[PDB]
Enzyme design. Structure first.
Site, short mmCIF file in Angstrom:
data_model
loop_
_atom_site.label_atom_id
_atom_site.label_comp_id
_atom_site.label_asym_id
_atom_site.label_seq_id
_atom_site.Cartn_x
_atom_site.Cartn_y
_atom_site.Cartn_z
N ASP A 17 5.14 5.70 5.50
CA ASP A 17 5.27 4.27 5.24
C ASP A 17 4.20 3.45 5.96
O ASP A 17 4.29 2.21 5.92
CB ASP A 17 6.68 3.71 5.56
CG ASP A 17 7.68 4.11 4.50
OD1 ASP A 17 7.33 4.15 3.31
OD2 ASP A 17 8.82 4.44 4.86
N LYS A 20 -0.63 4.90 3.49
CA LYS A 20 -1.65 5.84 3.01
C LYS A 20 -1.86 5.69 1.50
O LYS A 20 -3.02 5.64 1.03
CB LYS A 20 -1.20 7.26 3.33
CG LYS A 20 -1.15 7.45 4.84
CD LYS A 20 -0.76 8.91 5.18
CE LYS A 20 0.62 9.37 4.67
NZ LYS A 20 1.77 8.52 5.23
N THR A 21 -0.76 5.68 0.71
CA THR A 21 -0.93 5.62 -0.74
C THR A 21 -1.39 4.25 -1.19
O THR A 21 -2.24 4.13 -2.08
CB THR A 21 0.40 5.98 -1.37
OG1 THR A 21 0.75 7.29 -0.90
CG2 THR A 21 0.36 5.97 -2.89
N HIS A 80 5.41 14.18 5.14
CA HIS A 80 4.88 14.87 6.29
C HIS A 80 4.74 16.38 6.08
O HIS A 80 3.69 16.96 6.41
CB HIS A 80 5.79 14.58 7.48
CG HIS A 80 5.38 15.31 8.69
ND1 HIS A 80 4.13 15.15 9.24
CD2 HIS A 80 6.03 16.20 9.47
CE1 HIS A 80 4.03 15.89 10.33
NE2 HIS A 80 5.17 16.56 10.48
N1 LIG Z 1 2.89 -6.01 4.45
C1 LIG Z 1 2.26 -4.89 4.08
N2 LIG Z 1 2.95 -3.91 3.53
C2 LIG Z 1 2.17 -2.86 3.21
C3 LIG Z 1 0.81 -2.72 3.39
N3 LIG Z 1 0.38 -1.49 2.93
C4 LIG Z 1 1.46 -0.91 2.48
N4 LIG Z 1 2.58 -1.68 2.64
C5 LIG Z 1 3.93 -1.34 2.20
O1 LIG Z 1 4.46 -0.35 3.04
C6 LIG Z 1 5.28 0.56 2.27
C7 LIG Z 1 4.78 1.97 2.49
O2 LIG Z 1 3.45 2.06 1.97
P1 LIG Z 1 2.93 3.44 1.36
O3 LIG Z 1 1.54 3.24 0.89
O4 LIG Z 1 3.93 3.98 0.40
O5 LIG Z 1 2.93 4.34 2.68
P2 LIG Z 1 2.67 5.90 2.92
O6 LIG Z 1 4.03 6.52 3.07
O7 LIG Z 1 1.86 5.97 4.16
O8 LIG Z 1 1.96 6.39 1.71
C8 LIG Z 1 5.20 0.08 0.81
O9 LIG Z 1 6.33 -0.69 0.44
C9 LIG Z 1 3.92 -0.75 0.80
O10 LIG Z 1 3.89 -1.76 -0.18
C10 LIG Z 1 0.08 -3.77 3.98
O11 LIG Z 1 -1.13 -3.83 4.21
N5 LIG Z 1 0.91 -4.85 4.30
MG LIG Z 2 2.33 7.85 0.26
#
Ligand SMILES: Nc1nc2c(ncn2[C@@H]2O[C@H](COP(=O)(O)OP(=O)(O)O)[C@@H](O)[C@H]2O)c(=O)[nH]1
Ligand SMILES: [Mg+2]
Length: 404
Positions: A17, A20-21, A80
């Site tokens: 979260d 990354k994506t 993970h």
């Molecule tokens: N406020 C905010 N939320 C973000 C940002 N980048 C991602 N998110 C949110 O954080 C959550 C997790 O992001 P995601 O890309 O799925 O994370 P991952 O698990 O690392 O791939 C999602 O609901 C995204 O929309 C950002 O720059 N700002």
């Molecule tokens: Mg992801």
């Protein structure tokens, strides 16, 4: 004149979260404005497909894009566990990694674990994207998170002083493009931070050496007696090249010996040179078929040495993915599949991520452990191997340190 732009393989790593994506989607969307990528939607990349390879299943998204300087293959994974498996099996080449850290949360346990694994499996270089800058309105707090990340990187022997850290918001850059941002530098401050991230990736992550330029290595797969003057050894050249007349070494299982390559053959071709990727038959002067066997490798002399004991990062497969329900334990003696053949070994000295001794490693987990093989085999840092019982893969490993 370079006919093709240079190429590197990278990926987004970091805690769940942290973004990354969303960063992967933002990179492809920003570069698509320049004609340098197909834009990939978050929902597409997030729904990563399953991939299976040599008995190991991983969920991995693959995107491709280029900057003005370099073409990239970029991996991103949902969970993970997908990163643990991908990094330990080497299912994706990682010439470098973008570590995504949420500025709202700071480094978290998988931030630490992914840095640990990147060091242990040999990822050369890291660039950091400090994401979710939109959630943090105090510059003071952002600097403290940057210092915390630099200290963390240094604690795993990455150069925390030299690693580029770019702060921004992957989500705000994607929304900016959706709202009409041009993708040109200076048009939008959130898009500019994605452009700056890719400038730092271009400059700081080195392009890998071409495989044909690395020292020759070929695992022997089969051997043939055709004349009395030597044996033909067949395999696929893993890296480098070999030319008629060159001295090579036969490494592993028997004392290291050198021979001259007096012929290179492929189907319907007599060659002066075999190259990385080629399936070849090499005529080895003076070698008898009895001297040479599967599990040995052919190599540029002195470029790889035989060993019996090493530290490794090991992942234990879950029963669901084809492993066993029972943990690995010290003194367990499974088979180690090293390029072409099983070698019996014993595992020992399980070391938890905090440095303490561990009693076991359960299925689905990973740990540092020592492997001692019954016979010497060519081993180098970064070599992958499978752990097997009765021909089924029950674990996967990567050599992290040679001991003997
Ligand atoms: N406020 C905010 N939320 C973000 C940002 N980048 C991602 N998110 C949110 O954080 C959550 C997790 O992001 P995601 O890309 O799925 O994370 P991952 O698990 O690392 O791939 C999602 O609901 C995204 O929309 C950002 O720059 N700002
Ligand atoms: Mg992801």
């Amino acid at each position: 004149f370079e006919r093709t732009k240079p190429h590197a393989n990278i990926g987004t790593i970091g805690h769940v979260d942290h973004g990354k994506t969303t960063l992967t989607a933002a990179i492809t969307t920003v570069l698509a404005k320049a004609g340098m990528a197909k834009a990939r939607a978050y929902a597409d990349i997030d729904a990563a497909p399953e991939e299976k390879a040599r008995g190991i299943t991983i969920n991995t998204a693959h995107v491709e894009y280029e900057t003005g300087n370099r073409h990239y293959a970029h991996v991103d994974c949902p969970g993970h566990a997908d990163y643990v498996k991908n990094m330990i099996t080497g299912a994706a080449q990682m010439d470098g990694a973008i570590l995504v850290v949420s500025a709202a949360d700071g480094p978290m346990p998988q931030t630490r674990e992914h840095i640990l694994l990147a060091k242990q499996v040999g990822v050369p270089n890291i660039v950091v994207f400090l994401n979710k800058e939109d959630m943090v309105d105090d510059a003071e707090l952002l600097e403290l998170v940057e210092l915390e990340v630099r200290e963390l990187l240094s604690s795993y022997d990455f150069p925390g002083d030299d690693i580029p850290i770019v702060a921004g918001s992957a989500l705000q850059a994607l929304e900016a493009i959706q709202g009409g941002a041009s993708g040109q530098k200076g048009d939008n401050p959130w898009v500019d931070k994605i452009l700056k991230l890719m400038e730092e990736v271009d400059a700081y992550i080195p392009t890998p050496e071409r495989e044909v330029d690395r020292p020759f290595l070929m695992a022997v797969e089969d051997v043939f007696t055709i004349t009395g003057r030597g044996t033909v050894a067949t395999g696929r050249i893993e890296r480098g090249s070999v030319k008629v007349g060159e001295t090579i070494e036969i490494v592993g299982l028997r004392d290291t010996r050198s021979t001259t390559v007096t012929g290179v053959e492929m189907f319907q071709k007599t060659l002066d040179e075999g190259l990385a990727g080629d399936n070849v038959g090499l005529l080895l002067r003076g070698i008898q078929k009895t001297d040479i066997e599967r599990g040995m490798v052919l190599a540029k002399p002195g470029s790889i040495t035989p060993h019996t004991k090493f530290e490794s990062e090991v992942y234990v497969l879950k029963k669901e993915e084809g492993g066993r329900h029972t943990p690995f334990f010290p003194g367990y003696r499974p088979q180690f599949y090293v390029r072409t053949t099983d070698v019996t070994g014993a595992i020992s000295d399980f070391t938890a991520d905090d440095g303490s001794a561990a009693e076991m490693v359960i299925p689905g987990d990973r740990i540092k452990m020592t492997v001692e093989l019954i016979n010497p085999i060519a081993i180098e840092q970064g070599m992958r191997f499978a752990i097997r019982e009765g021909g089924r893969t029950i674990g996967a490993g990567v050599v992290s340190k040679i001991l003997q």
